[PDB]
Amino acid sequence: AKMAFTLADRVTEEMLADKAALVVEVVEENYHDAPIVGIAVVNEHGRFFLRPETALADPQFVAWLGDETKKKSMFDSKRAAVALKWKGIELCGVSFDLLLAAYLLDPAQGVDDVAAAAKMKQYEAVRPDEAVYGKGAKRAVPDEPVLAEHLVRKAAAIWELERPFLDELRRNEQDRLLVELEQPLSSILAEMEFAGVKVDTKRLEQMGKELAEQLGTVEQRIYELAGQEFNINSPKQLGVILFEKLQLPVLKKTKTGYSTSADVLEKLAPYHEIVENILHYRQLGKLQSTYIEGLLKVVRPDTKKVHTIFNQALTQTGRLSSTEPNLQNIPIRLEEGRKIRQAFVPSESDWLIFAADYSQIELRVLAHIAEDDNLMEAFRRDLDIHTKTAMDIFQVSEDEVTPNMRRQAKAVNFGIVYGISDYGLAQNLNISRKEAAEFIERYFESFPGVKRYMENIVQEAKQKGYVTTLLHRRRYLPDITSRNFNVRSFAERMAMNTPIQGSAADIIKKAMIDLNARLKEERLQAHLLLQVHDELILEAPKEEMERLCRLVPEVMEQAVTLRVPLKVDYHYGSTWYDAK
DNA sequence: GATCACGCACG
DNA sequence: ACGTACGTGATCG
Ligand SMILES: OC[C@H]1O[C@@](CO)(O[C@H]2O[C@H](CO)[C@@H](O)[C@H](O)[C@H]2O)[C@@H](O)[C@@H]1O
Numbered sequence A: 001a002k003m004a005f006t007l008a009d010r011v012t013e014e015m016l017a018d019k020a021a022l023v024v025e026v027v028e029e030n031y032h033d034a035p036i037v038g039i040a041v042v043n044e045h046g047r048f049f050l051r052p053e054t055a056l057a058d059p060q061f062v063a064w065l066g067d068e069t070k071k072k073s074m075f076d077s078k079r080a081a082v083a084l085k086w087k088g089i090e091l092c093g094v095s096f097d098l099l100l101a102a103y104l105l106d107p108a109q110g111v112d113d114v115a116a117a118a119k120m121k122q123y124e125a126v127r128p129d130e131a132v133y134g135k136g137a138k139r140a141v142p143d144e145p146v147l148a149e150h151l152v153r154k155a156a157a158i159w160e161l162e163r164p165f166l167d168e169l170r171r172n173e174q175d176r177l178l179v180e181l182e183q184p185l186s187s188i189l190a191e192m193e194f195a196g197v198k199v200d201t202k203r204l205e206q207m208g209k210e211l212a213e214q215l216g217t218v219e220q221r222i223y224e225l226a227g228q229e230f231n232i233n234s235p236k237q238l239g240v241i242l243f244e245k246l247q248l249p250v251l252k253k254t255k256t257g258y259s260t261s262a263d264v265l266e267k268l269a270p271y272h273e274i275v276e277n278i279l280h281y282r283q284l285g286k287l288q289s290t291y292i293e294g295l296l297k298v299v300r301p302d303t304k305k306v307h308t309i310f311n312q313a314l315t316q317t318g319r320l321s322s323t324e325p326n327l328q329n330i331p332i333r334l335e336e337g338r339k340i341r342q343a344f345v346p347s348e349s350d351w352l353i354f355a356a357d358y359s360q361i362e363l364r365v366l367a368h369i370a371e372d373d374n375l376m377e378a379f380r381r382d383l384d385i386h387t388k389t390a391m392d393i394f395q396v397s398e399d400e401v402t403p404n405m406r407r408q409a410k411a412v413n414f415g416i417v418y419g420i421s422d423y424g425l426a427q428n429l430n431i432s433r434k435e436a437a438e439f440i441e442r443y444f445e446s447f448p449g450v451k452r453y454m455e456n457i458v459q460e461a462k463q464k465g466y467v468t469t470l471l472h473r474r475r476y477l478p479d480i481t482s483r484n485f486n487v488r489s490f491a492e493r494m495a496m497n498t499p500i501q502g503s504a505a506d507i508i509k510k511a512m513i514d515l516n517a518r519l520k521e522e523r524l525q526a527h528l529l530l531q532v533h534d535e536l537i538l539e540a541p542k543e544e545m546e547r548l549c550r551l552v553p554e555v556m557e558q559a560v561t562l563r564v565p566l567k568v569d570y571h572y573g574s575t576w577y578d579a580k
Numbered sequence B: 001g002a003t004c005a006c007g008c009a010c011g
Numbered sequence C: 001a002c003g004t005a006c007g008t009g010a011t012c013g
């Protein structure tokens, strides 16, 4: 059963052909400044394993890596590219990435190794990485014989699988999505991750000290009000204090006991002074544990930068996610948490942070796809969309829209984008299912094109088996035919939501590609640092701000052409906090 | 130790 | 609600 290959002691010319499957193996999950443990090459001339110390010190091999005209097929080329950037080596000419190809074909498969991608096409002559390396405490790089055969079998699988994957992408009309959107984006994300974001660790440490003082104060107040010390971060110990010792009403249970979620606590606050203190404690504790201590653990002590990893092949809608650290959920909604952003600073002297965000991209995308006359007109007038929605559903003039009305119309707009249901809206607004249904009925009377879209997309999902986004991303929805109401309804909400969230994802990905090309043409030093779903965050010399104020919004607004305008707001300042 | 349950940060 | 990451404490095994 063994797979033949040359365990090479030196790089030869036949290893440097102009098309190859290439494996540059990085086993550590976080590949930043991580070891490359081995290299495999499969091409017309055979199969090869190279020790990294050998290949990466060889000038011909390094030149071949960096030659755009020598084409490589890979799995997770970003991982390799970034590990190589940390070694000062450029990887070019990646023409096929099996991880991104598998992801586009079916995001639900959760493909995260070559074996899983291969199994999609009945190819099983390669082991799962977890089988080779083990998992958790028992994870380890095996001896050279085992390692080499594994890397060669992965390269061989990539070599074999490129054509059937490209053929299927082409049938799905996704070949341009791979080659013109996701692959070029992978290189851009590699640059962003490698650059990292500078952190003002002294400021974080000072915030930490202040938080600890406040946590101490509130913690003691809680014990005082409870008449007893207990573990406040234990929903089970906390439940006993609240619902047994203090006799608060049980408005909601969980699988294993009493609910103490913030929405339940907010309702209990009027009964006892301890409740507001628990909420405050939770707010502070979240900032302290997750943000202060968490960021300080992953900042690089030499450069004081954090280097996130954007998972490009995870979400079911086509969004990125971000890990270790997650830089897409830094606090902003509450002022106390928002100050954490004062610790994210430019990487060079006399540079600034510049942030640009789409205004209501999801609702604008919905206006476009539904071709709803009223909603399109609203965005063509650049109206406040929540005030307009309130005017329509409550049948009042602009003058007559009260703050509570705008708040409830806003909630309907979110429900509409998420996939509307009377239960979901009733829970959000703390009203009855009947009252929620009335709001939804009035919404659909005012936006009949949106109503027709929502009916039609559920039917299309049933008929075709999947739904698609503007640039032809797809998501299969087999549960749409379930005879279980809850299972089927969740799938219907995915059918409604995915073309909106996913098309917004497509647009900003295209904007990033367009933006980097414009930045290069203009030879600006500005560069991307982060993407947070509908916003791009850059840093640049202060002398580039005026040019960015015109360039970045224009590129983001013109990335696609819709039946309504796209609108982009922007701000800049000395820290991420100030870019407001 | 690993995994689950719960809670909560973001768009 | 739709889409994510992850920290703490409880429980599985
Ligand atoms: O390199 C990112 C790429 O690798 C995968 C596995 O193929 O995820 C791995 O790397 C992530 C980043 O460090 C980890 O969060 C992770 O758990 C690990 O499996 C892909 O999912 C991802 O696209």
Ligand SMILES: OC[C@H]1O[C@@](CO)(O[C@H]2O[C@H](CO)[C@@H](O)[C@H](O)[C@H]2O)[C@@H](O)[C@@H]1O
Pocket (backbone or CB within 6 Å): A454, A455, A458, A459, A462, A480, A488, A492
């Ligand atoms: O009454 C139709 C209305 O119900 C929805 C669910 O909100 O779809 C249901 O009705 C269908 C056919 O008309 C089925 O295909 C279906 O699976 C069922 O859930 C709406 O989509 C539809 O407009």
Ligand SMILES: [Mg+2]
Pocket (backbone or CB within 6 Å): A357, A358, A359, A360, A534
């Ligand atoms: Mg915005």
